[PDB]
Design a protein around this nucleic acid. Structure first.
Ligand SMILES: [Cl-]
Ligand SMILES: [Zn+2]
Ligand SMILES: [Zn+2]
Ligand SMILES: [Zn+2]
Ligand SMILES: [Zn+2]
Lengths: 80, 79
DNA sequence: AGTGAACTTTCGGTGAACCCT
DNA sequence: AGGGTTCACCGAAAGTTCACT
């Protein structure tokens, strides 16, 4: 019944606020992983790649760039 | 039979010059003592009622003021 | 081996209940 | 009547899981 602004990263339907922004379950999980797994991606284009529900899985580098850009907090990804 | 001017829940009496619930007294006490600033996720017109009051803290705090809760009525922490 | 829908867990704000004059 | 504190509890936001390609 509760409506949230679209995922800030890919603009798909949001499950809620994840790491400071309205985010979809995909972008929440992706961000948690790139931080926990200390992933370092590379753009196999020119870094200007566009993120939306249909393309979000094509460039992991540009998807992680947008997570950061919109304001996802790396600090709130628990590390023990 | 008193009602909280802010959320509509049953009121105990006047707190910070306003008929309010025990929750709105507490939230305002916390906000003023800690000098807290909030941001509305939506368009600053969030429905503040018994159910949805904890959803947006911004709109709950702006409604406390609109219903006239005096920030000066909040004293400093005892010890 | 990565993704994401659907779960389970965490912990700090909330507030019912309690002081005091 | 209205200031002050308190701490179980609950839900938002965290982690977890597991089909599916
Ligand atoms: Cl004031
Ligand atoms: Zn997304
Ligand atoms: Zn790219
Ligand atoms: Zn209230
Ligand atoms: Zn609001």
């Amino acid at each position: 019944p509760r409506i949230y602004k679209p995922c800030f990263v890919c603009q798909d339907k949001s499950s809620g606020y994840h790491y400071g922004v309205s985010a979809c379950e995909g972008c929440k999980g992706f961000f948690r992983r790139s931080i926990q797994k200390n992933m370092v991606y590379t753009c196999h284009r020119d870094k200007n790649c566009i993120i939306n529900k249909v393309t979000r899985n094509r460039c992991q580098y540009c998807r992680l760039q947008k997570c950061f850009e919109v304001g996802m907090s790396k600090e709130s990804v628990r590390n023990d | 039979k008193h009602i909280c001017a802010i959320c509509g829940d049953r009121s105990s009496g006047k707190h910070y010059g306003v008929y309010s619930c025990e929750g709105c007294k507490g939230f305002f006490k916390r906000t003023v003592r800690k000098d807290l600033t909030y941001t509305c996720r939506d368009n600053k017109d969030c429905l503040i009622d018994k159910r949805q009051r904890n959803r947006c803290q911004y709109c709950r705090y702006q409604k406390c003021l609109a219903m006239g809760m005096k920030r000066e009525a909040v004293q400093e922490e005892r010890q």
